[PDB]
Symmetry: C3
Subunit: 212 residues, 3 copies
Amino acid sequence: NYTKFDVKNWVRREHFEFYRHRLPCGFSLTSKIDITTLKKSLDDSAYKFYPVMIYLIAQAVNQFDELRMAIKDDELIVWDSVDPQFTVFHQETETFSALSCPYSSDIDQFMVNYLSVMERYKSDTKLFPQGVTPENHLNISALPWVNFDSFNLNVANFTDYFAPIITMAKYQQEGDRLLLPLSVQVHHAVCDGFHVARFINRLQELCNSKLK
Amino acid sequence: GNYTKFDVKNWVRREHFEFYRHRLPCGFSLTSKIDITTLKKSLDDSAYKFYPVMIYLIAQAVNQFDELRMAIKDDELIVWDSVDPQFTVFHQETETFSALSCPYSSDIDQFMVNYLSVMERYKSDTKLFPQGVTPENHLNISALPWVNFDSFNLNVANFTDYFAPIITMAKYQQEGDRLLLPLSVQVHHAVCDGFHVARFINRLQELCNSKLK
Amino acid sequence: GNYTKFDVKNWVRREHFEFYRHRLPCGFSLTSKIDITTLKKSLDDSAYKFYPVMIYLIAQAVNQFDELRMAIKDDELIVWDSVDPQFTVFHQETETFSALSCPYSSDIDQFMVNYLSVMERYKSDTKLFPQGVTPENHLNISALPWVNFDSFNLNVANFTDYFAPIITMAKYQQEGDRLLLPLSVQVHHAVCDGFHVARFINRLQELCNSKLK
Ligand SMILES: CC(=O)OCCNC(=O)CCNC(=O)[C@H](O)C(C)(C)COP(=O)(O)OP(=O)(O)OC[C@H]1O[C@@H](n2cnc3c(N)ncnc32)[C@H](O)[C@@H]1OP(=O)(O)O
Ligand SMILES: CC(=O)OCCNC(=O)CCNC(=O)[C@H](O)C(C)(C)COP(=O)(O)OP(=O)(O)OC[C@H]1O[C@@H](n2cnc3c(N)ncnc32)[C@H](O)[C@@H]1OP(=O)(O)O
Ligand SMILES: O=C(N[C@H](CO)[C@H](O)c1ccc([N+](=O)[O-])cc1)C(Cl)Cl
Ligand SMILES: O=C(N[C@H](CO)[C@H](O)c1ccc([N+](=O)[O-])cc1)C(Cl)Cl
Ligand SMILES: O=C(N[C@H](CO)[C@H](O)c1ccc([N+](=O)[O-])cc1)C(Cl)Cl
Ligand SMILES: [Zn+2]
Ligand SMILES: [Zn+2]
């Protein structure tokens, strides 16, 4: 569930109106995450790369209100917590589906939740096997077959859609660092450059930290 | 060219097609670096030039995959049997470009005959479309050889039902022991997922690493 | 300021202007790295700070090229004699930004006078546009100094007839013995092709590598 944001006392109330109504826009930015440390943490564990990245991304998002915003009854709200909606691939059809699972700050509980959803739905070729996407969501996708330096979604109508869209590519070694490309796409009504940078820098810190 | 009506009812992506055509219309771009170390070395011995060879290889990779030859015709999904490249050419005298097309052939020598013929007839014409209207069965290829980029994205005001891939290359540059060509690929999500764009780029990489004859 | 009414009928891009304004309305972004190794050394013997110097050099390069100073005014294409930078200013206390403008000068010292004056008058003002309406003859410049990026693109719902370039710079980063500044340039294709954007980036690179004094 959610709270109504106090727009009238917000430092960004002018910006919110401006980028929602006067100059509606968002932006994407693609950055490399250094996963050198994370790969060492992983290689010494039983967790898999994609669910760990999902967990760390969702953890970072759940720290920052402006990454959990939405419009409900034409008012700005903030979800208390958001769950990741992530894509999965079906090699037999060469199609993908979107699944979600409950976020938990505990990585072991997260992994339980994830592996359970995968067990039930990993072969289901419906686009949305679980039915309606949780309203409190953040979108995560990977393209593990190719490296990219840039990714951008051209959406014909993004009116009042404020959930961040995160896309990863195939990681690759670049000199002395193992680098994961990560695109983050937001609506400027709720996120400026500073908030996106804060998110990325926090995710980088999480990748460089003990997993638990 | 010739086309066939696609069987959407029996398509594994039937649901995705409706979703990304009607519910959430969108496409995406991505920019990837192609390793052209082997190609540049191959081209050192070739009668043919870098840009027309890249056009040929891009067109060959596109022609391999049905989802990169899709269109709406008469408000139904079709697949072109084959698509022809429409490429941009620069005019040094005016600092303007034109778009030319030529018939695709899987045989590089025949392609280059076709390419040279179009260039001979039209290369000095400063009209945007010297040949008249773009053939319906087309891909778009452009080069920006004057600057290296890591990103390129087209912001198109109305891309409704436009499914032909748009390919843009930057100035190549050396990165450690490889020569890398930045290549941007922009598609519509109704017909192409990340898998299909990745498959295209990786196939193109294979073709760049292939013998020219 | 002063502007001229552009002769579209005798323009070499008459047909491109029509095409990308009306037939296929679009623009593009592209992100490139600027080598600021020389500039950074230049600034180690200067009182001038990195951000205003970059504003100056970007504005200087834009002011050299007519196609980066275009607009629609009284429903016709015009060229501004000169454009002034509108730049984003960050307020650390609130973690919000404002947009400020100051007059462009070809003299770096006068430009810095102009910049420091506006900062003194308005740096504590949290309004988005403290000075009032953006000057009609403007260029937009933003910094995003907190994170390095290789791509940046603005997804603008309606960009009809907006021809002023949008320039965005990231956190600079050391790569070997080069210090690289990511720079995104986003234009309308009606007034700028790949050639002009490349020409702008390369000119900026040349200015960064030149004496400031
Ligand atoms: C947004 C947007 O897309 O706008 C741009 C619109 N498009 C245009 O303006 C058209 C641009 N096209 C061109 O300039 C030319 O068609 C192009 C790419 C230079 C090819 O010219 P061309 O037919 O004479 O054939 P090429 O031999 O391939 O090119 C001439 C030289 O440029 C070199 N070259 C071609 N493409 C590239 C590249 N991407 N990076 C670096 N060098 C290049 C090529 O290797 C050759 O070099 P050398 O002489 O050292 O061997
Ligand atoms: C436009 C757009 O967004 O389209 C994409 C649409 N989405 C899709 O098509 C779904 C793509 N997703 C997938 O393919 C799978 O979810 C994905 C990413 C491979 C994860 O699969 P998985 O859940 O079985 O779990 P993982 O162990 O993390 O991944 C499987 C393997 O790939 C490796 N891997 C996963 N992600 C990456 C990556 N980004 N780069 C390099 N290697 C990777 C991982 O190391 C493991 O290989 P090894 O066992 O040999 O070490
Ligand atoms: O469509 C989705 N994912 C795709 C996968 O390629 C993509 O990441 C995307 C995400 C969000 C989106 N949006 O909200 O506009 C559009 C595409 C989810 Cl809505 Cl299932
Ligand atoms: O306009 C074209 N090419 C430009 C050159 O900058 C660009 O590559 C482009 C391609 C396709 C396009 N579209 O289909 O939306 C828009 C721009 C061709 Cl359609 Cl002529
Ligand atoms: O909105 C502005 N700047 C933002 C900062 O994130 C961005 O650089 C931007 C610039 C121009 C623009 N436009 O003209 O469509 C949209 C966003 C200025 Cl108009 Cl104040
Ligand atoms: Zn309003
Ligand atoms: Zn018209």
